[PDB]
Design a protein around this nucleic acid. Structure first.
Lengths: 100, 63, 130
RNA sequence: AUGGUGAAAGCCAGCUGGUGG
RNA sequence: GAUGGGGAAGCUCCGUGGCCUGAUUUUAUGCAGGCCACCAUCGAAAGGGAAUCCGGUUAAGAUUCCGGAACCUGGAUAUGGAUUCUUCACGGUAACGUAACUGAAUGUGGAGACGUCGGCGCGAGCCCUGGGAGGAGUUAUCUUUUCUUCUUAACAGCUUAUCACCCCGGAGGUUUAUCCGGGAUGGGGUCUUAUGGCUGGAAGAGGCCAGCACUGCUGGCUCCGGUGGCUUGUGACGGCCUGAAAAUCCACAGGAAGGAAUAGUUUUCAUGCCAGGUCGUACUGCUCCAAG
């Protein structure tokens, strides 16, 4: 939080391996997190900024499918500009697209 | 006394016993700048956004 | 060629790791695009396996390994050698410089050394320099 | 008498010319 | 200088234990073992030593009083994290680095803590002044003239490294002053922050002016530069025979000790709280600052 303090406001540790890609959705408030364990998660955030209040964050659901190869899982991901669709890549020479 | 540049950090101190607001003038074109200090912490429509949002449990005197 | 082939024992000299014995997995005399010079790949133990009630024994036998590339200038040649192919599959040039495979290689090395100090073999490697 | 008190080395250029002091 | 002792009948003289472990210690509730090496004290208000700076106050006081803002020693501690899903973490080959990330005996290292002198880089004070903003003065002779004000603290984060050190290299670089090399010239980097710039402190302080009150207030300015001799602190080199002691802090080799299921261990991490005694302290004054 660039307005609260230098240190992170909150930290997550549910990931079982190194986190490789984290990006913000261009339109929606959701942000995705992926790691080498082949697990992808998406969190909703209360981006409200009309008042001096911290944003509330909630998990949505777990995602998987990027089998770990050579200990490497999800390599990179990117959010769709306008809809809650996520593109993911992995070490298995395969990429997966997730939709509602 | 520290170079705090965070607004919510200052608000936490205010919400944590009287503040003060300082007004200064400078040119780069001429421009106005203001400071907010509490008991030392001194933060650098920012003035309105800060003052109007101040909790009623605090007293602030200009200059 | 040089005698610093796979399985050759070595000791770190710089990076504050001096005194920690390491085992050479594979040498690179010509180096690579990164580190274009003679440098070897080595693995070692950060903590040595130093009327017991069978509980302190497990703690003593616990080993914390480390893996890192080291230049020839920071290696002490050793007159001893031991088996290294037991974990060459996970410890390789590709594994270095790319997570999280470093953690898996460290875990494999830890398991191998825990299953090596027990039923003593290659004792000189597990000896800490005072 | 008794018992106390005080005080020019070096180095640069071609033996000759130079720098440091 | 007492003290373990020794002369002198004699006042008097000479001589320079406190720590750890154990089921409570088998003929029965009476104590066993292991560590190390010595001699108190006094003697420095110019030595070492943890810590405060700006403005104002008097009939005498202040770095003590006040207004403002920090620093150092010690302790219960309270919260969050870290230690990682579980038992004392990592990154780069490297100089090295992280907010934290247990360390007993035993040995060692750094600071403390160490002569004298020559030169040079750097911060910065002084001498000088350019442009500009206000006050004062000469002025029959010439003078866009002479004086005068333009100030920025302890402390904390950035930023800042001569020196020193690390990777490629394989036959000249360099100081004021001759110093370095078969590992140099060069290319690529790390670090000890001396004092340099920023901000907060801090313009609300102080100072330079104008106005009116008839016992104060209201308006502005307090700016932007430069290099040409004196000075100080430090850094880095170079000439000659070893220039103190102790107190106190930190680290290193060390791996005994302790670490899990209605809070595993700790708080060299961050925030917060409390206390910090006695004396000297006014004045005068062998030793301190010195413009052109």
């Amino acid at each position: 939080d660039l307005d609260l303090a230098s240190t992170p406001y909150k930290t997550l540790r549910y990931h079982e391996k190194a986190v490789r890609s984290v990006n913000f959705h261009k339109k929606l408030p959701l942000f995705s997190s992926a790691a080498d364990d082949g697990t992808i998660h998406v969190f909703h955030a209360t981006v409200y900024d009309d008042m001096m209040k911290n944003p509330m964050i909630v998990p949505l659901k777990k995602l998987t499918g990027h089998k770990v190869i050579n200990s490497l899982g999800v390599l990179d991901a990117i959010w769709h500009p306008r809809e809650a669709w996520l593109f993911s890549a992995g070490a298995d020479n395969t990429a997966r697209l997730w939709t509602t | 006394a520290r170079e705090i540049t965070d607004i919510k950090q200052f608000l936490e101190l205010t919400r944590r016993k009287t503040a003060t607001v300082k007004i200064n003038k400078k040119l780069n074109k001429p421009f106005r700048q203001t400071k907010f200090k509490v008991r030392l912490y001194t933060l650098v429509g920012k003035a309105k956004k800060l003052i109007q949002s101040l909790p009623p449990t605090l007293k602030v005197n200009r200059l | 060629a040089k005698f610093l082939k796979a399985g050759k024992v070595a000791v770190v000299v710089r990076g504050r790791y001096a005194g920690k014995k390491v085992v050479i997995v594979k040498p690179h005399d010509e180096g690579s695009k990164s580190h274009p010079f003679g440098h070897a790949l080595v693995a070692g133990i950060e903590r040595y396996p130093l009327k017991h009630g069978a509980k302190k024994v497990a703690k003593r036998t616990k080993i914390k390994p480390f893996i890192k590339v080291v230049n020839y200038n920071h290696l002490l040649p050793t007159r001893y050698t031991l088996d290294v192919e037991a974990f060459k599959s996970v410890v390789s040039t590709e594994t270095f410089e790319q997570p999280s495979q470093r953690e898996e290689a460290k875990k494999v090395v830890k398991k191998a050394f825990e299953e090596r100090h027990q039923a003593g073999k290659n004792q000189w490697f597990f000896s800490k320099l005072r």
